[PDB]
Amino acid sequence: AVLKIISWNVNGLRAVHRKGFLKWFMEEKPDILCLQEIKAAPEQLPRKLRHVEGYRSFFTPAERKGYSGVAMYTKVPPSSLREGFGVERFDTEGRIQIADFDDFLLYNIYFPNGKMSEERLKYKLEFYDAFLEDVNRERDSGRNVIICGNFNTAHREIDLARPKENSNVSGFLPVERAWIDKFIENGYVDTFRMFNSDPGQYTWWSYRTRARERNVGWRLDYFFVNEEFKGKVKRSWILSDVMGSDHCPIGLEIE
């Protein structure tokens, strides 16, 4: 069977709801939809966005009300989900959903933005290491893995419009970029670059200064799989023209 997964950093679920989310979700018909930055308390949500016909949903909020948070809709439920790495400084921020879909684990992860402070940058780089430990433990078990979400780092100079102007900015720091290399040489494939080696391919633009209109963006959202799984990947693409957030969606087709 062809399995379609979408990943979208919605930056406000009730915000994207006011900008055509449910209409879009209906016409896209993914098998699994992974959502980052819900910024909403799940039980205090219009029941029509928690309930979508054909889908089971799973919300993982931050303990801080209206901050961060992730979610997952799926036609087939997972056998269960894990909501953390087992390090509670990493597990209280609404950033982790690890769903067990038999053939594979799906990591739906909202990786921390390290721009606000030197401590948040430290948290981000530490978050990255807990994640790597976690994913390696599981594929070393024999588990196949799919990881999508807001990684919050552009990997190579090709992954943003202004590489040289951003070398001392979180999102393109040589240390953040090197972890992606480290993540990659640990046996994981950036699935987008399996099929598309072109520039101009971004998933995030700043709302201001007509950034989207001028394609001044960063490729911050990713689909990774473990090397052994990559022959199952049919498509890895970007939904550049879907509006409603400062991020666009990305897709994966697996067989």
Count Cβ atoms below 10 Å from residue 189 Cβ, excluding itself. Answer: 18
SS3 7: strand
CB burial of 79-93 (b: ≥16 within 10 Å; e: otherwise) equals eebbbbbeeeebbbb
- What is the DSSP-derived secondary structure letter of residue 59? E
Which resolution, in Å, applies to this structure? 2.4
Q: What is the DSSP string of 68-125?
A: --EEEEESS--S-EE-S-S-HHHHSSS-EEEEE-SS-EEEEEEPPP-SS-HHHHHHHH
Residue 113: is it exposed, middle or buried by C-beta count within 10 angstroms (0-12/13-18/19+)? Answer: middle
Distance of alpha carbon 199 from alpha carbon 216, whole angstroms: 12
Going from the C-alpha of 94 to that of each of 41, 69, 112, 159, 223, the distances in angstroms are: 11, 4, 10, 26, 19
Q: Of the CATH numbers 3.50.50.60, 1.20.1330.10, 3.60.10.10, 3.40.640.10, which one belongs to the domain with range 1-255?
A: 3.60.10.10
> CB within 8 A of 228, min separation 6: which ones?
139, 144, 187
The domains of the chain are located at 1-255
Residue 211: is it exposed, middle or buried by C-beta count within 10 angstroms (0-12/13-18/19+)? Answer: middle
The answer to whether 224 touches 189, Cβ cutoff 8 Å, is yes
CB burial of 165-187 (b: ≥16 within 10 Å; e: otherwise) equals ebeeebbbbeebbebbeebeeee
Distance of alpha carbon 62 from alpha carbon 93, whole angstroms: 4
The answer to whether 39 touches 13, Cβ cutoff 8 Å, is yes
Placement of tokens 């001044």 in the chain: 216
Task: Estimate to the nearest angstrom the gap between the alpha carbon of 158 and the chain centroid.
Answer: 19
The answer to whether 151 touches 111, Cβ cutoff 8 Å, is yes
